[PDB]
């Protein structure tokens, strides 16, 4: 039983620090570094990352926060408090009451299913095609930030970025894709220095920063022909200049058989091959990455070919609008316009770095709406509404599975409790009236963060997507069953 | 958290009472300062020999005397219930709820609990005082103290109660069933099967006189004389002194004519028995044996007090005045051999109903025989709760009452608005210690009998009254068995005077502890 | 908590460990030194536990239950404690596994209830079948005397042992009624039996060569006061100036002594016994009348004289009644042992007797006297109780055998509890083989071989190491011992395991 | 330092106690795992007891014997290493208790070797080959508990009978009469046509592929048909796609077609497809062509139909289809309307001993999970039926050897009787630790299970009985005594044979050490 206590002690001591980090009114934290520095930021991600821990239970919460941030952009402290309170509420049952841990784990599996059903009942429908409705959603990650002034332009960049990746289809044959969108590879932003944020547009295609091998080239091509290749064009290896100039010309003549208007070489391009393809009316781009060829083949359609003599006749330049050598910001660009490219602009490098983390968290809220047209009330409304429904279902729950079940109902009230403690109101008086409010009034009545008195969400909606509530409850049960599964501690190799 | 540390000190005493209540409980060894080993189930002896300093435990000791003096049962019910109320209150003290509003929550829940106790009454005794009717009250009292004697001691105790309790109704002026009305004696040898019930006080002195027993005549007149048997002298001093041998002949012959003249009038009045509370002379035994008067001597003044409540005799400080108002009546006086020693007993047949009886106990081991005497003595005061002050009603026992009160109190918790709902909900949770106590002592699994017990009390009845099971108790068996028994099978129930009075004492005991936020002491 | 229960386990084993070498007739003896500075060595568990005075409350329970065993029965006080404390060790590993102590105690009462039923089945009532009247008690006495230094002389010892029991009423028999006086020196086979009572003869005073030891029917009279001239403490202070009065006060003090002295002659009793020393004055006047007197007699021997000839003790010599006198058939004073010993013979009303023992040393005779007490209890209980059971490993191994088969039909924790109680019964035959020098490892395994062949009477031979039947060894035990031992050991064990906490108050 | 006497015997028990306590909580499927932290600060967690013992740091040299025991156990059986350590733990605890009894450890070791040889002969007199495989399937409970976490678990009652009966007919002679169950078989397909309740069992391998033209008949050559597996397409051959033509190929691909119809093969499988010119030519010959065949499918068909998959045929500049050389024997090839499904049913052939299962469900999202869940399910069934003799688990062997060796110890009656009695009771720790992680009371289910084997084994040696059922195990989910034969929990017998043999070799080496010298 000594290791079971350490799992509770190590998990609570780390989670207790970030209990005050939840909400817009969250209090600041001070972390003194051994080198003499301090951390003034209240973000739970930057605090616990710099805190060195010993017991492995704290390291499990660090990897859980990194995985949770890849799904949702906000609500990092919500998952830690919810997953840490369930273990804290099971402390008297597992230790004092001598309840077997598998009985608790078995009860958390059935409580996870009922928890997801209550969220779907209190959820409200939302139109994903309405551009005006999506502005009030992303606004949760907009306000109290530098992007509040450009929010009108920021929402246009966030919505138009996921429209290219998303695919809307359904049927009973191939199933439902559930609107799978990849923000990482396709929606990856590209920060270009200079320009203006108002001029930032969503570019559909791929972008490359490498310049053109020749200074003077055609600024636009009517029908661009894209040809992809692997092996570079150079004199091969087993009076001399006559053979070297002829060998390169023969390798370039095979490409000119179809007379392409553009030449793309994966490896470097020698100076001998640049003069032969210059008079042919085609641009040559040296040093093209291999990972880009997969994305370039989608915006173009050129088949990947290794040897220069293996080029297939099926290669065409279709599905390419224009080719622009135009220079923006003293840097030569290339415009080849399921995958778009986000072009970010600003007045300095510090502006681009701030928009980066802000736009990623802005699109994470819009992405969660695409997984399903449902929203949940914030400010502790959904957290308390579930706890009220958990106590009503206990009438059929008689048997040993009922005792660990009560630890979940008290854990759902911990999220609104931390907001009241940071608000300054009486936590006993407000939580008692809030729990009785759901038993009579509607489930949509939450708690205001600025005031701290029970109010209806009709005034200020603060509508969070269901994915935030889903992943918070799902990962909390998995984290609770993770520490309860390990009853022993053994060190050494 | 000094108020929390005061609860931790009671927690050490709380675990002591968990092994007390119940037939599967444990007995504690009490070593007296005189070097005597004392082992008993009743915990009032432990708290009496142990002086308490800290107030939180001392209030529980004073609360034990409140339950012990007024009733012979429920001493463990108050100590366990009041100790759990402070344990469940640690969650409210931690959250920041002040101990002032915690007391207000128990006061509102106490009135709601006492109101539901009147609806928990199923059956009621008709006060018939039948041999079979007295078994239902005494059987749960013998339990939780001595195991295996429950069926044996049921018929022995119920026989003596009906002899000392008259049959009357609608009269509350004259009190009945005094504490001293039942005496219990023990002797080495034999067994519990050979034990008998005597209708009067048994005297252990031997019949030194030549008259062993009286005749078969009805209503033998008995006389209780405090003055010793000798020649009539002055009540104040009057010590006979010896001077010369010539006066010795007058002293011997003087006592012969005076005693024979005074005892002749006593035998003519019909008095065949004389009780002498002091020493008896040699010449007194000569005249009483020729007239057929049985000589009985009782040097102990404690036994003469209970004798006056049987035959109605009164002790006479002087000698030679046979007042008829001071004379008693006895049906039969004989001499029986109890435990190998022949002693003169006191009993009667079909007349002059006696208010004092004596139960003769027999056992192989003297150590365990003394514990049986204490279990029966504790069972006497339990009968006192059957009188007019709500002694006819009864509540289901064996843990059946504490489980039903959970669904009743928790229903009013969410219904009553305000901050009092936190203490009301936790007030019903504290009742879970009673079923868990019987489960830990009986070796049953707390993860099986306890959770399945709530499923028996929770049913769906197409009506406005929950019914069809009043009988669900807690299993006291020591052998593995599927399910639990019923209350009707063993007729194990709790009295109304025991349950209702224990609630008011338990609430006031935990209130004083929560009311103390600090202590003030001075140098001795 | 659980710490107090574990502390009580080692307390019961410590008391049990001291009684293990004392189990059995051949077992070792324990040395106990009382605060009285008196050396006491005995193998009887009663006297052992009474002289220890253990302050531990649970260890005192094992002492208190031994007194109850000595009261009802009186035999087996050592084995009842060993069996009671054995359950403490068997239940020790069960406490750490989480098994409640009440479930363990509950399984014992169900096993003992089934064990008592098997005792009546193994008890066969036999009296005149294949046995005679005289040879019945003689064959039982040679069993307890075997493997002893008296085995060669046991032929003459059984005749004196059987006659000592038959000399008393078969309805009421007591071991205290048979007196034993140790005589230092002499041959062991020359001992004789005495019908009356004898004393130590501590009389140190001169006046010998008188009061002959050959009597016909002398009258016995009890003496109280002192008949010698000079008193022990007080005296008479007389101040006279006359020379003739100095001799008068000498006879004046003697005249008051001769008053009660002459009244003894008026009674006409040749035997005078007194708890106080009789000086040379009384024995000188009694020499001419052939009247014997002996002083400094123990109080325990005076009570046997009253029960012998039906005498009485009177304070003075005046009011002595004639019916208080008594007489024997023959009085002979034996010089055996370099000391003269008075004895009575031929008392028909005597409720007690005396058996004289002779040997090479006092320490050798002390082992013979105690080895005889074990044989007397077997001879005494033979006529009292007709239900006997086979002992010496016979019954002990079968009670544990049946509980193993009955546990297979029982489900739950009580299955291993009865098996633990059946295993706890193996300590009784173990210590018997260890205290006898035999190997306990081999005999325990070899005995279980024939024990499973269907015969329940196979015991353990105490003479030569081997397995066999005790029926031919003439090892008999009454049924009341085996029944009360299982009940007393279980009752004492149930009280020890029921103590969660030990509270001790100083003052 | 040098330690001798009984002091080292107590240190060897305490050293192996902490090592054995590591795997006691991980035994059984209900067991729990733990994390192993190194000096760097990293860690890992796994439910396998062999991985934990491999990374376990044992400082005492006495506990290092169990470390080498885990490596030797994995090289042979590879499973059951967790249970081996627990068995050797109780053997050391009971042997140390006999030290106070003045029993020499060699006699204790000798008694364990005699009881081991008798336990081997006892296994052959109880167990036997798999029975009751007709009219019922006991293996249905293995796949049901594995798929209970998926939607298929609801309908798994009907699907379990299809999987168990499948592998029953998959067993073939392999190479020279092996009679074994292969690890690759029963091609799984998907059907979106109807609900999962309507899933039908196909008697043989069903190839998933489409046709080219609807003019050809879907059923031809019912009596016998020869399937010819091909790789390169029948389309006009191309030289290169990178060379420009500035100014035979059809006659080469058409010449091999002449060798097809003349060979009598009515089934042509081409991985790269078939042109339209070679299509109509097959219509007049009633040959059913298939375009874009799967390469992984034809390699299994070649071994099933007796053909040989060849990418290109040359044979010294020769051109032909190798008539009758690659042509296999297939009884019938029929194509029927599957109600929104299209597959090629291959029923009979020379020698196949194969089977197939086509799964049907609501959508493709559910069918993707049904195929992955069937792989991990049947894989346990493959390893279960791989051994010719199987034993039920749940503590049946440990309880049977406890009662059997109890009466067998009477054959000596001198010394080994005390060692055999402790060796038989030492196996009771295995069923006891299973109830600890199952939340059930260990003193109940283990004790009640012993009472059932007591009366059941009385009439077994007498060869006369009325109703006797052995193999009573432990049910961890429901906490009750059930028959493992009807439950269907099986274990390879070679495990326990090598488990009890290896566990003793590690226990003997520990009891034979009376001195430890550490320099």
From Swiss-Prot, chain A:
It comes from the Eukaryota. GO terms for cellular component: chaperonin-containing T-complex. GO terms for biological process: chaperone mediated protein folding independent of cofactor; protein folding. It is found in: Cytoplasm. Coiled coil: none annotated. The keyword S-adenosyl-L-methionine does not apply. Its main location: cytoplasm. Keywords: Acetylation, ATP-binding, Chaperone, Cytoplasm, Disulfide bond, Nucleotide-binding, Phosphoprotein. Pfam families: Cpn60_TCP1. CDD domains: TCP1_gamma. GO terms for molecular function: ATP binding; ATP hydrolysis activity; ATP-dependent protein folding chaperone; unfolded protein binding. Heterooligomeric complex of about 850 to 900 kDa that forms two stacked rings, 12 to 16 nm in diameter. PANTHER family: CHAPERONIN. NCBIfam families: chap_CCT_gamma (TIGR02344), thermosome_alpha (NF041082), thermosome_beta (NF041083). Molecular chaperone; assists the folding of proteins upon ATP hydrolysis. Known to play a role, in vitro, in the folding of actin and tubulin. In yeast may play a role in mitotic spindle formation. Belongs to the TCP-1 chaperonin family. This is T-complex protein 1 subunit gamma. The lineage of its organism: Eukaryota, Fungi, Dikarya, Ascomycota, Saccharomycotina.
From Swiss-Prot, chain B:
Keywords: ATP-binding, Chaperone, Cytoplasm, Isopeptide bond, Nucleotide-binding, Phosphoprotein, Ubl conjugation. GO terms for molecular function: ATP binding; ATP hydrolysis activity; ATP-dependent protein folding chaperone; unfolded protein binding. One of its GO terms (biological process) is chaperone mediated protein folding independent of cofactor. It comes from the Eukaryota. The modification Phosphoserine is found at residue 480. GO terms for cellular component: chaperonin-containing T-complex; cytoplasm. Molecular chaperone; assists the folding of proteins upon ATP hydrolysis. Known to play a role, in vitro, in the folding of actin and tubulin. In yeast may play a role in mitotic spindle formation. Heterooligomeric complex of about 850 to 900 kDa that forms two stacked rings, 12 to 16 nm in diameter. This is T-complex protein 1 subunit theta.
UniProtKB/Swiss-Prot annotation, chain C:
Belongs to the TCP-1 chaperonin family. Heterooligomeric complex of about 850 to 900 kDa that forms two stacked rings, 12 to 16 nm in diameter. It comes from Saccharomyces cerevisiae (strain ATCC 204508 / S288c) (Baker's yeast). Keywords: ATP-binding, Chaperone, Cytoplasm, Nucleotide-binding. It is found in: Cytoplasm. Gene3D superfamilies: GroEL, GroEL-like equatorial domain, TCP-1-like chaperonin intermediate domain. It holds the Pfam family Cpn60_TCP1. Molecular chaperone; assists the folding of proteins upon ATP hydrolysis. Known to play a role, in vitro, in the folding of actin and tubulin. In yeast may play a role in mitotic spindle formation. Its main location: cytoplasm. It comes from the Eukaryota. One of its GO terms (molecular function) is ATP hydrolysis activity. The gene is CCT7. This is T-complex protein 1 subunit eta. InterPro entries: Chap_CCT_eta (IPR012720), Chaperone_TCP-1 (IPR017998), Chaperonin_TCP-1_CS (IPR002194), Cpn60/GroEL/TCP-1 (IPR002423), GroEL-like_apical_dom_sf (IPR027409), GROEL-like_equatorial_sf (IPR027413), TCP-1-like_intermed_sf (IPR027410), TCP-1_chaperonin (IPR053374). One of its GO terms (biological process) is protein folding. GO terms for cellular component: chaperonin-containing T-complex; cytoplasm.
Curated annotation (Swiss-Prot), chain D:
The keyword Chaperone applies. Disulfide bonds: none annotated. One of its GO terms (cellular component) is plasma membrane. Pfam families: Cpn60_TCP1. The keyword Cytoplasm applies. It is found in: Cytoplasm. One of its GO terms (biological process) is protein folding. One of its GO terms (molecular function) is ATP-dependent protein folding chaperone. SUPFAM superfamilies: GroEL apical domain-like (SSF52029), GroEL equatorial domain-like (SSF48592), GroEL-intermediate domain like (SSF54849). It comes from the Eukaryota. Keywords: Acetylation, ATP-binding, Chaperone, Cytoplasm, Nucleotide-binding. Belongs to the TCP-1 chaperonin family. Heterooligomeric complex of about 850 to 900 kDa that forms two stacked rings, 12 to 16 nm in diameter. Molecular chaperone; assists the folding of proteins upon ATP hydrolysis. Known to play a role, in vitro, in the folding of actin and tubulin. In yeast may play a role in mitotic spindle formation. This is T-complex protein 1 subunit alpha. The gene is TCP1.
């Amino acid at each position: 039983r000594q290791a079971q206590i350490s799992n509770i002690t190590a998990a609570k001591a780390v989670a207790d620090v970030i209990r005050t980090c939840l909400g817009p009114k969250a209090m600041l934290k001070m972390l003194l570094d051994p080198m003499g520095g301090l951390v003034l930021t209240n973000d739970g991600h930057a605090i616990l990352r710099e805190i060195d821990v010993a017991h492995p239970a704290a390291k499990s919460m660090l990897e859980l926060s990194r995985t949770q941030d890849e799904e949702v952009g906000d609500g990092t402290t919500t998952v830690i408090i919810l997953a840490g309170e369930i273990l804290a509420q099971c402390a008297p049952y597992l230790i004092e009451k001598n309840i077997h841990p598998v009985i608790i784990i078995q009860a958390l599996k059935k409580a996870l299913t009922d928890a997801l059903e209550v969220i779907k009942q209190v959820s409200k429908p939302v139109d994903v095609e309405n551009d005006a409705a999506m502005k009030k959603l992303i606004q949760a990650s907009i306000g109290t930030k530098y992007v509040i002034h450009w929010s009108e332009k920021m929402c246009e960049l966030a919505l138009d970025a996921v429209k290219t990746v998303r695919k809307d289809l359904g049927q009973t044959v191939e199933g439902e894709p559930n609107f799978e969108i990849d923000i990482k590879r396709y929606v990856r932003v590209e920060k270009i220095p200079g320009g203006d944020v108002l001029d930032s547009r969503v570019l559909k295609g791929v972008l490359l920063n490498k310049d053109v091998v020749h200074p003077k080239m055609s600024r636009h091509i009517e029908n661009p022909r894209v040809v992809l290749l692997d092996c570079p064009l150079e004199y091969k290896k087993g009076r001399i200049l006559q053979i070297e100039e002829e060998q390169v010309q023969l390798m370039c003549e095979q490409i000119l058989a179809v007379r392409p208007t553009l030449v793309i070489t994966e490896k470097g391009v020698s100076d001998l091959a640049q003069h032969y393809l210059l008079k042919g009316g085609c641009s040559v781009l040296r040093r093209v990455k291999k990972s880009d060829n997969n994305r370039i083949a989608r915006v173009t359609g050129a088949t990947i070919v290794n040897r220069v003599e293996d080029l297939k006749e099926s290669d065409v330049g279709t599905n390419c609008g224009l080719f622009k050598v135009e220079m923006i910001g003293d840097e030569y660009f290339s415009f080849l316009d399921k995958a778009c490219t986000i072009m970010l602009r600003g007045g300095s490098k510090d502006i681009l770095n701030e928009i980066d983390r802000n736009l990623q968290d802005a699109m994470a809220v819009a992405r969660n709406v695409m997984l399903s047209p449902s929203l949940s009330p914030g400010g502790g409304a959904t957290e308390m509404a579930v706890s009220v429904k958990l106590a009503e279902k206990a009438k059929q729950l008689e048997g040993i599975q009922q005792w660990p079940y009560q630890a979940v109902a008290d854990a759902m009230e911990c999220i609104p409790r931390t907001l009241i403690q940071n608000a300054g109101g009486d936590p006993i008086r407000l939580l008692s009236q809030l729990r009785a409010k759901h038993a009579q009034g509607n489930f949509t009545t939450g708690i205001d963060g600025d005031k701290g008195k029970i109010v209806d969400m009709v005034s200020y909606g603060i509508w969070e997507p269901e994915v935030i509530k889903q992943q918070s409850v799902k990962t909390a049960i998995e984290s609770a069953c993770l520490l309860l599964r390990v009853d022993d501690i053994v060190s050494g190799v | 958290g000094q108020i929390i540390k005061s609860i931790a000190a009671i927690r050490e005493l709380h675990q002591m009472c968990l092994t007390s209540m119940g037939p599967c409980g444990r007995n504690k060894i009490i070593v007296n300062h005189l070097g005597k080993i004392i082992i008993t189930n009743d915990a009032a002896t432990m708290l009496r020999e142990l002086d308490i300093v800290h107030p939180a435990v001392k209030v529980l000791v004073m609360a034990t005397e409140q339950q012990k003096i007024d009733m012979g049962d429920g001493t463990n019910l108050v100590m366990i219930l009041a100790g759990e109320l402070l344990n469940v209150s640690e969650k409210l003290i931690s959250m920041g709820l002040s101990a002032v509003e915690i007391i207000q929550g128990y006061n509102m829940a106490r009135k709601f609990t006492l109101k539901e106790l009147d609806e928990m009454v199923v059956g009621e005794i008709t006060d018939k005082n039948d041999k079979n009717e007295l078994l239902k009250m005494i059987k749960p009292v013998i339990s939780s103290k001595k195991y295996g004697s429950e069926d044996i001691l049921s018929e022995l105790v119920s026989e003596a109660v009906s002899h000392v309790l008259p049959v009357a109704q609608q009269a509350g002026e004259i009190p009945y069933f005094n504490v001293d009305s039942i005496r219990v004696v023990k002797i080495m040898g034999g067994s519990l099967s050979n034990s008998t019930v005597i209708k009067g006080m048994v005297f252990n002195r031997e019949p030194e006189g030549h008259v062993k027993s009286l005749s078969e005549d009805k209503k033998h007149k008995v006389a209780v004389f405090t003055c010793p048997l000798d020649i009539a002298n002055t009540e104040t001093k009057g010590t006979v002194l010896l001077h010369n041998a010539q006066e010795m002949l007058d002293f011997s012959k003087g006592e012969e004519k005076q005693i024979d003249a005074m005892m002749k009038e006593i035998a003519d009045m019909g008095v065949e028995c004389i009780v002498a509370g002091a020493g008896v002379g040699e010449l007194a035994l000569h005249y009483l044996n020729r007239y057929g008067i049985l000589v009985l001597k009782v040097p102990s003044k404690f036994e003469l007090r209970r004798l006056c409540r049987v035959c109605g005799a009164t002790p006479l400080p002087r000698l030679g005045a046979p007042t008829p108002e001071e004379l008693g009546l006895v049906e039969t006086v004989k001499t029986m051999e109890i435990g190998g020693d022949r002693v003169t007993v006191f009993k009667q047949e079909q007349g002059e109903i006696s208010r004092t009886s004596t139960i003769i106990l027999r056992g192989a081991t003297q150590n365990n025989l003394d514990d049986i005497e204490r279990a029966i003595d504790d069972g006497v005061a339990a009968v006192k709760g059957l009188m007019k002050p709500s002694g006819g009603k009864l509540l289901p026992g064996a843990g059946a009452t504490e489980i039903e009160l959970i669904s009743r109190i928790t229903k009013y918790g969410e219904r009553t608005p305000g901050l009092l709902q936190l203490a009301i909900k936790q007030f019903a949770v504290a009742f879970e210690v009673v079923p868990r106590t019987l489960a830990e002592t009986a070796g049953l699994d707390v993860n099986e009998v306890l959770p399945n017990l709530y499923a028996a009390h929770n049913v769906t009845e197409p009506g406005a009254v929950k019914t069809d099971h009043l009988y669900k108790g807690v299993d006291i068996d020591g052998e593995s068995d599927e399910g639990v028994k019923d209350i009707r099978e063993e007729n194990i129930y709790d009295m109304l005077a025991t349950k209702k009075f224990a609630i008011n004492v338990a609430t006031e005991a935990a209130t004083t502890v929560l009311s103390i936020d600090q202590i003030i002491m001075a140098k001795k | 908590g659980k710490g107090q229960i574990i502390s009580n386990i080692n307390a019961c084993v410590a008391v049990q460990e001291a009684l293990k070498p004392t189990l059995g007739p051949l077992g070792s003896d324990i040395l106990i030194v009382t605060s009285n500075q008196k050396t006491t060595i005995s193998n009887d568990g009663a006297t052992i536990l009474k002289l220890l005075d253990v302050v531990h409350p649970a260890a005192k329970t094992l002492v208190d239950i031994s007194r109850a065993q000595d009261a009802e029965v009186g035999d087996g006080t050592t084995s009842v404690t060993i069996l009671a404390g054995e359950l403490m060790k068997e239940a020790k590993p069960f406490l750490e596994e989480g098994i409640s102590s009440h479930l363990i105690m509950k399984g014992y009462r169900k096993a003992v209830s089934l064990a008592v039923e098997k005792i009546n089945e193994l008890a066969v009532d036999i009296t005149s079948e294949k046995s005679s009247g005289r040879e019945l008690l003689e064959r039982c006495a040679r069993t307890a005397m075997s493997s002893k230094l008296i085995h060669n002389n046991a032929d003459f010892f059984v005749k004196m042992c059987v006659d000592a029991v038959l000399s008393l009423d078969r309805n009421d028999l007591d071991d205290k009624l048979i007196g034993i006086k140790k005589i230092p020196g002499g041959a062991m086979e020359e001992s004789l039996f005495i019908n009356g009572v004898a004393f130590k003869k501590t009389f140190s005073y001169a006046g010998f060569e008188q009061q002959p030891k050959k009597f016909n029917n002398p009258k016995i009279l009890s003496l109280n006061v002192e008949l010698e001239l000079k008193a022990e403490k007080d005296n008479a202070e007389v101040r006279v100036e006359h020379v003739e009065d100095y001799q008068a006060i000498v006879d004046a003090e003697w005249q008051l002594i001769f008053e009660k002295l002459r009244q003894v002659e008026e009674t006409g009793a040749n035997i005078v016994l007194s708890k106080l020393p009789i000086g040379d004055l009384a024995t000188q006047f009694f020499a001419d009348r052939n009247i014997f007197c002996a002083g400094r007699v123990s109080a325990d021997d005076m009570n046997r004289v009253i029960q012998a000839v039906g005498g009485s003790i009177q304070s003075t010599t005046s009011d002595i009644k004639p019916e208080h006198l008594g007489t024997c058939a023959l009085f002979e004073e034996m010089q055996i042992g370099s000391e003269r010993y008075n004895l009575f013979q031929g008392c028909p009303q005597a409720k007690t007797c005396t058996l004289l023992l002779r040997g090479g040393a006092e320490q050798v005779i002390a082992e013979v006297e105690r080895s005889l007490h074990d044989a007397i209890m077997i001879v005494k209980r033979a006529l009292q109780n007709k239900l006997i059971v086979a002992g010496g490993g016979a019954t002990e191994m079968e009670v544990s055998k049946c509980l193993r088969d009955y546990s297979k039909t029982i489900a739950g924790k009580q299955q291993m509890i009865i098996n633990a109680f059946a295993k706890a019964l193996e300590v009784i035959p173990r210590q018997l083989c260890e205290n006898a020098g035999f190997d306990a490892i081999e005999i325990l395994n070899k005995l279980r071989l024939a024990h499973s062949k269907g015969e329940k009477w196979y015991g353990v031979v105490f003479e030569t190491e081997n397995i066999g039947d005790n029926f031919a060894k003439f090892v008999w035990e009454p049924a009341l011992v085996k029944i009360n031992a299982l009940n007393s050991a279980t009752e004492a064990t149930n009280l020890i395991l029921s103590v969660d906490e030990t509270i001790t108050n100083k003052g | 330092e040098k330690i001798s006497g009984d002091d080292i015997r107590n240190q060897n028990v305490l050293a192996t106690m902490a090592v054995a306590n590591v795997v006691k909580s991980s035994l059984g499927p209900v067991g729990l795992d733990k994390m192993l932290v190194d000096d760097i600060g990293d860690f890992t967690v796994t439910n396998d007891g062999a991985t934990i013992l491999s990374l376990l740091d044992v400082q005492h040299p006495a506990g290092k014997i169990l470390v080498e025991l885990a490596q030797q156990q994995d090289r042979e059986i590879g499973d059951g290493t967790t249970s081996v350590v627990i068995i050797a733990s109780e053997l050391l605890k009971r042997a140390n208790e006999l030290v106070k009894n003045k029993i020499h450890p060699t006699t204790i070791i000798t008694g364990f070797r005699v009881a081991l040889r008798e336990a081997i002969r006892f296994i052959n007199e109880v167990l036997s080959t798999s029975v009751d495989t007709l009219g019922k399937e006991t293996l249905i409970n293995i796949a049901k508990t594995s798929m209970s976490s998926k939607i298929i678990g609801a309908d798994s009652d009907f699907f379990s009978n299809m999987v168990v009966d499948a592998l029953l007919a998959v067993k073939t002679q392999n190479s020279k009469g092996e009679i074994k169950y292969p690890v690759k078989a029963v091609n799984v397909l998907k059907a979106h046509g109807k609900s999962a309740t309507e899933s039908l069992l196909v008697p043989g391998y069903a190839l998933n592929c489409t046709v080219a033209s609807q003019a050809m008949p879907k059923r031809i050559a019912g009596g016998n048909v020869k399937i010819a597996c091909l790789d390169l397409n029948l389309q006009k051959a191309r030289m290169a796609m990178g060379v420009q033509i500035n100014i035979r190929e059809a006659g080469i691909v058409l010449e091999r077609v002449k060798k097809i119809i003349d060979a009598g093969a009515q089934v042509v499988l081409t991985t790269k497809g078939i042109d339209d010119l070679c299509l109509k030519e097959f219509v007049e010959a009633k040959i059913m062509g298939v375009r874009r065949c799967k390469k992984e499918d034809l390699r299994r068909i070649a071994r099933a139909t007796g053909a040989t998959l060849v990418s290109s045929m040359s044979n010294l500049e020769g051109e032909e289809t190798f008539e009758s050389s690659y042509l296999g024997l297939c009884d019938e090839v029929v194509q029927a309307k599957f109600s929104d499904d299209e597959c090629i049913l291959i029923k009979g052939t020379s020698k196949h001993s194969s089977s197939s299962i086509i799964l049907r469900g609501a959508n493709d999202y559910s069918l993707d999970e049904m195929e992955r869940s069937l792989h991990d399910s049947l894989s346990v069934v493959k390893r279960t039926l791989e051994s010719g003799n199987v034993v039920p688990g749940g503590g049946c062997v440990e309880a049977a050897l406890n009662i059997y060796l109890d009466n067998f110890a009477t054959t000596v009656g001198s010394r080994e009787q005390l060692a055999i009695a402790e060796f038989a009771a030492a196996l009771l720790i295995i069923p006891k630790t299973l109830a600890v992680n199952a939340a059930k009371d260990s003193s109940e289910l283990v004790a009640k299970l012993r009472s059932y084997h007591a009366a059941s084994q009385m009439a077994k040696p007498e060869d006369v009985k009325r109703r006797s059922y052995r193999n009573y195990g432990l049910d961890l989910i429901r906490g009750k005594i059930v028959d493992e034969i009807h439950a269907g929990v099986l274990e390879p017998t070679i495990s326990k044979v090598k488990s009890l043999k290896s566990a003793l070799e590690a226990c003997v080496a520990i009891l034979r050490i009376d001195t430890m010298i550490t320099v």
